[PDB]
Scaffold this active site. Structure first.
Site, PDB file in Angstrom:
ATOM      1  N   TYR A  48     -13.807  -8.934  -3.642  1.00 56.48           N
ATOM      2  CA  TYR A  48     -14.728  -8.193  -2.239  1.00 56.48           C
ATOM      3  C   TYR A  48     -15.719  -8.525  -3.206  1.00 56.48           C
ATOM      4  O   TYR A  48     -17.047  -9.193  -2.898  1.00 56.48           O
ATOM      5  CB  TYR A  48     -14.442  -7.429  -1.899  1.00 56.48           C
ATOM      6  CG  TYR A  48     -13.193  -7.274  -1.062  1.00 56.48           C
ATOM      7  CD1 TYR A  48     -13.097  -7.710   0.342  1.00 56.48           C
ATOM      8  CD2 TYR A  48     -12.153  -5.855  -0.911  1.00 56.48           C
ATOM      9  CE1 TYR A  48     -12.246  -8.239   1.045  1.00 56.48           C
ATOM     10  CE2 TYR A  48     -10.835  -5.979   0.087  1.00 56.48           C
ATOM     11  CZ  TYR A  48     -11.112  -7.222   1.106  1.00 56.48           C
ATOM     12  OH  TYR A  48     -10.420  -6.980   2.321  1.00 56.48           O
ATOM     13  N   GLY A  80      -4.345 -17.455  -5.263  1.00 56.57           N
ATOM     14  CA  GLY A  80      -4.863 -17.376  -6.143  1.00 56.57           C
ATOM     15  C   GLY A  80      -5.025 -19.120  -5.894  1.00 56.57           C
ATOM     16  O   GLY A  80      -4.983 -20.374  -7.085  1.00 56.57           O
ATOM     17  N   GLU A  92      -8.089  -1.836  -7.138  1.00 53.03           N
ATOM     18  CA  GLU A  92      -8.655  -2.527  -8.145  1.00 53.03           C
ATOM     19  C   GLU A  92      -8.962  -3.937  -8.002  1.00 53.03           C
ATOM     20  O   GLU A  92      -9.966  -4.366  -7.809  1.00 53.03           O
ATOM     21  CB  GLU A  92      -8.989  -2.160  -9.327  1.00 53.03           C
ATOM     22  CG  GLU A  92      -9.848  -2.082 -10.089  1.00 53.03           C
ATOM     23  CD  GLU A  92     -11.272  -1.855  -9.944  1.00 53.03           C
ATOM     24  OE1 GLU A  92     -12.416  -1.696 -10.728  1.00 53.03           O
ATOM     25  OE2 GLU A  92     -11.213  -1.016  -9.238  1.00 53.03           O
ATOM     26  N   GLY A 151      -7.545 -16.507   0.643  1.00 49.23           N
ATOM     27  CA  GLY A 151      -8.481 -16.174   0.836  1.00 49.23           C
ATOM     28  C   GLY A 151      -9.316 -16.279   0.747  1.00 49.23           C
ATOM     29  O   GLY A 151     -10.218 -15.448   2.448  1.00 49.23           O
ATOM     30  N   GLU A 190       0.935  -1.423   0.368  1.00 51.56           N
ATOM     31  CA  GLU A 190      -0.089   0.388  -0.245  1.00 51.56           C
ATOM     32  C   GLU A 190       1.192   1.178  -0.280  1.00 51.56           C
ATOM     33  O   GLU A 190       0.402   1.870   0.211  1.00 51.56           O
ATOM     34  CB  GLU A 190      -1.376   0.213   1.051  1.00 51.56           C
ATOM     35  CG  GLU A 190      -2.196  -1.134   1.036  1.00 51.56           C
ATOM     36  CD  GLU A 190      -2.788  -0.978   2.352  1.00 51.56           C
ATOM     37  OE1 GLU A 190      -4.281  -1.432   2.090  1.00 51.56           O
ATOM     38  OE2 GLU A 190      -2.074  -1.156   3.296  1.00 51.56           O
ATOM     39  N   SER A 216      -8.418  -6.603  -5.645  1.00 52.02           N
ATOM     40  CA  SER A 216      -8.928  -6.953  -4.131  1.00 52.02           C
ATOM     41  C   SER A 216     -10.190  -6.275  -4.921  1.00 52.02           C
ATOM     42  O   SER A 216     -11.331  -6.849  -4.094  1.00 52.02           O
ATOM     43  CB  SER A 216      -8.224  -6.193  -2.952  1.00 52.02           C
ATOM     44  OG  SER A 216      -6.900  -6.443  -2.932  1.00 52.02           O
ATOM     45  N   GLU A 231      -9.756  -5.971   9.470  1.00 53.58           N
ATOM     46  CA  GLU A 231      -9.467  -4.314   9.960  1.00 53.58           C
ATOM     47  C   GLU A 231      -7.950  -4.897   8.518  1.00 53.58           C
ATOM     48  O   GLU A 231      -8.088  -3.820   7.477  1.00 53.58           O
ATOM     49  CB  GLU A 231      -7.931  -4.497  10.678  1.00 53.58           C
ATOM     50  CG  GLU A 231      -7.139  -2.954  11.195  1.00 53.58           C
ATOM     51  CD  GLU A 231      -7.954  -1.769  11.048  1.00 53.58           C
ATOM     52  OE1 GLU A 231      -9.061  -0.718  11.307  1.00 53.58           O
ATOM     53  OE2 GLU A 231      -6.647  -0.890  10.171  1.00 53.58           O
TER      54      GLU A 231
HETATM   55  C1  COA Z   1      -7.165  -9.977  -1.236  1.00 52.74           C
HETATM   56  C2  COA Z   1      -6.111 -11.115  -1.560  1.00 52.74           C
HETATM   57  C3  COA Z   1      -6.810 -11.227   0.190  1.00 52.74           C
HETATM   58  C4  COA Z   1      -7.585 -12.379  -1.654  1.00 52.74           C
HETATM   59  O1  COA Z   1      -6.529 -14.249  -0.773  1.00 52.74           O
HETATM   60  P1  COA Z   1      -5.599 -15.111  -2.219  1.00 52.74           P
HETATM   61  O2  COA Z   1      -5.804 -15.728  -1.346  1.00 52.74           O
HETATM   62  O3  COA Z   1      -5.468 -14.069  -3.693  1.00 52.74           O
HETATM   63  O4  COA Z   1      -7.088 -15.677  -2.716  1.00 52.74           O
HETATM   64  P2  COA Z   1      -8.600 -16.514  -3.337  1.00 52.74           P
HETATM   65  O5  COA Z   1      -7.114 -17.259  -3.856  1.00 52.74           O
HETATM   66  O6  COA Z   1      -9.048 -17.549  -2.458  1.00 52.74           O
HETATM   67  O7  COA Z   1      -8.514 -15.617  -4.316  1.00 52.74           O
HETATM   68  C5  COA Z   1      -8.501 -15.127  -5.382  1.00 52.74           C
HETATM   69  C6  COA Z   1      -8.300 -16.220  -7.071  1.00 52.74           C
HETATM   70  O8  COA Z   1      -7.622 -17.398  -7.236  1.00 52.74           O
HETATM   71  C7  COA Z   1      -9.438 -18.039  -7.953  1.00 52.74           C
HETATM   72  N1  COA Z   1      -8.663 -19.572  -6.959  1.00 52.74           N
HETATM   73  C8  COA Z   1      -8.350 -19.618  -6.008  1.00 52.74           C
HETATM   74  N2  COA Z   1      -8.322 -20.996  -6.557  1.00 52.74           N
HETATM   75  C9  COA Z   1      -8.778 -22.018  -7.674  1.00 52.74           C
HETATM   76  C10 COA Z   1      -8.276 -22.685  -7.760  1.00 52.74           C
HETATM   77  N3  COA Z   1      -8.619 -23.965  -7.719  1.00 52.74           N
HETATM   78  N4  COA Z   1      -9.506 -23.024  -9.367  1.00 52.74           N
HETATM   79  C11 COA Z   1      -9.765 -21.246 -10.312  1.00 52.74           C
HETATM   80  N5  COA Z   1      -9.555 -20.409  -9.508  1.00 52.74           N
HETATM   81  C12 COA Z   1      -9.279 -20.465  -8.238  1.00 52.74           C
HETATM   82  C13 COA Z   1     -10.155 -17.806  -7.051  1.00 52.74           C
HETATM   83  O9  COA Z   1     -11.750 -17.742  -7.542  1.00 52.74           O
HETATM   84  C14 COA Z   1     -10.097 -16.077  -7.047  1.00 52.74           C
HETATM   85  O10 COA Z   1     -10.664 -15.356  -7.884  1.00 52.74           O
HETATM   86  P3  COA Z   1     -11.977 -14.506  -8.088  1.00 52.74           P
HETATM   87  O11 COA Z   1     -12.125 -13.053  -7.368  1.00 52.74           O
HETATM   88  O12 COA Z   1     -12.402 -14.544  -9.267  1.00 52.74           O
HETATM   89  O13 COA Z   1     -12.704 -15.558  -7.117  1.00 52.74           O
HETATM   90  C15 COA Z   1      -4.880 -11.349  -2.409  1.00 52.74           C
HETATM   91  O14 COA Z   1      -5.339 -11.298  -3.236  1.00 52.74           O
HETATM   92  C16 COA Z   1      -3.726 -10.304  -1.778  1.00 52.74           C
HETATM   93  O15 COA Z   1      -3.171  -9.860  -0.343  1.00 52.74           O
HETATM   94  N6  COA Z   1      -3.752  -9.092  -2.467  1.00 52.74           N
HETATM   95  C17 COA Z   1      -3.722  -7.919  -1.240  1.00 52.74           C
HETATM   96  C18 COA Z   1      -4.075  -7.581  -0.008  1.00 52.74           C
HETATM   97  C19 COA Z   1      -5.509  -6.368  -0.281  1.00 52.74           C
HETATM   98  O16 COA Z   1      -5.587  -5.941  -0.980  1.00 52.74           O
HETATM   99  N7  COA Z   1      -6.122  -5.926   1.294  1.00 52.74           N
HETATM  100  C20 COA Z   1      -7.551  -5.723   1.459  1.00 52.74           C
HETATM  101  C21 COA Z   1      -7.575  -4.140   1.838  1.00 52.74           C
HETATM  102  S1  COA Z   1      -7.361  -5.108   3.635  1.00 52.74           S
END
Ligand code: COA
Ligand code: COA
Lengths: 161, 162
Positions: free
Chosen positions: A138, A100, A132, A104, A26, A134, A90
């Site tokens: 959400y 991915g 965008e 999350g 960030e 994230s 938070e």
């Molecule tokens: C946002 C965040 C926390 C999400 O966690 P993540 O571990 O990447 O989440 P997931 O892996 O469960 O989901 C990410 C994606 O992979 C896809 N995915 C995961 N496993 C999958 C599988 N087996 N097959 C197909 N797709 C899959 C998901 O569908 C999803 O995308 P979608 O939004 O179209 O559903 C992470 O990307 C990150 O740390 N980014 C920055 C955090 C942020 O900006 N802060 C929040 C404000 S406090």
């Protein structure tokens, strides 16, 4: 795979590290002045000021540095005088190479379960307007927008009053 | 002429009343759907989800003419914070020092718990408050600038839960 679970006192080092990683993501890492000791005293005493869920991965997939924690969410409960109990998310972050895989999503699943168990009417949380990716993450999960002007009064002035 | 003290479960009736009035003041009295039962449970059950200070003086027969609702939050970068959720003093009783005394008590709460700061909300559509706070050192936390407050309602939560 991985396991989502409540944080423990020994996770504070990893939590602080991930906090600095999200802050850096960030563009504000320099702002993180909280230490491991703070996290322990504030999150693992008789009356915690926050709650965390962490994602632990098996040994075969620890980070190069040898870390087993690759993600987390920090939350606490807040109150709205018009509707009642709310779960406030938070901080929420997953290490780059571990995104991915569904971590999350699973974390959000646990959070929702905490919310229903404590009977929260909703879960609120902020998101950097530019963040965008994230934001869409959400949104695809019911997230919606909700304005005023946030003010603060530092201890410098609070002490005065 | 007035006293500021912590609220008790028997003050919940007055709390809701004042919550309604502040909501009416914000042109949204209809929005308050919380019940007195909810407040007592949420505020005086085994786990208090909020804390409340009430102003008591010696109209409709009530002695409670003001209050402040707050709880503690956490900032991952700076730590413990005191969060002022609601703050209100009935119109006839404004201007005598009640609000200021409530802020005084809230401040003592913040220092006792070692909170690094107290956050809340100020309306731009009112210069008085802005300065009513600014004169109190209330720095304009435009830190909110660049963030989009989001919400996931129960419906979508139950969906992710089960
Ligand atoms: C946002 C965040 C926390 C999400 O966690 P993540 O571990 O990447 O989440 P997931 O892996 O469960 O989901 C990410 C994606 O992979 C896809 N995915 C995961 N496993 C999958 C599988 N087996 N097959 C197909 N797709 C899959 C998901 O569908 C999803 O995308 P979608 O939004 O179209 O559903 C992470 O990307 C990150 O740390 N980014 C920055 C955090 C942020 O900006 N802060 C929040 C404000 S406090
Ligand atoms: C904002 C609010 C809580 C403040 O409480 P209050 O009782 O009116 O505040 P005060 O007691 O300090 O009275 C304000 C003024 O009276 C004057 N005052 C206070 N004590 C005094 C005394 N003993 N003798 C003479 N004047 C006095 C002061 O000049 C003071 O304003 P200033 O310190 O900025 O110059 C109240 O006006 C109100 O309920 N407003 C709507 C609520 C709202 O805007 N909050 C929503 C956010 S959650």
């Amino acid at each position: 795979k991985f396991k989502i679970r409540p944080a423990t006192a020994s996770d504070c080092s990893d939590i602080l590290r991930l906090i600095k990683e999200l802050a850096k993501y960030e563009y504000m890492e320099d702002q993180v002045i909280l230490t491991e000791k703070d996290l322990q005293e504030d999150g693992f005493g008789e009356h915690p000021f926050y709650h965390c869920l962490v994602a632990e991965v098996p040994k075969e997939h620890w980070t190069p540095e040898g870390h087993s924690i690759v993600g987390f969410a920090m939350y606490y409960f807040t109150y709205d005088p018009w509707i009642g109990k709310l779960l406030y998310l938070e901080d929420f972050f997953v290490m780059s190479d571990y995104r991915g895989f569904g971590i999350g999503s699973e974390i959000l699943k646990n959070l929702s379960q905490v919310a229903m168990k404590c009977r929260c009417s909703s879960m609120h949380f902020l998101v950097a307007e530019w963040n965008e990716p994230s934001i869409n993450f959400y949104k695809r999960r019911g997230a919606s927008d909700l304005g005023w002007r946030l003010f603060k009064i530092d201890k410098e002035y609070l002490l005065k009053m």
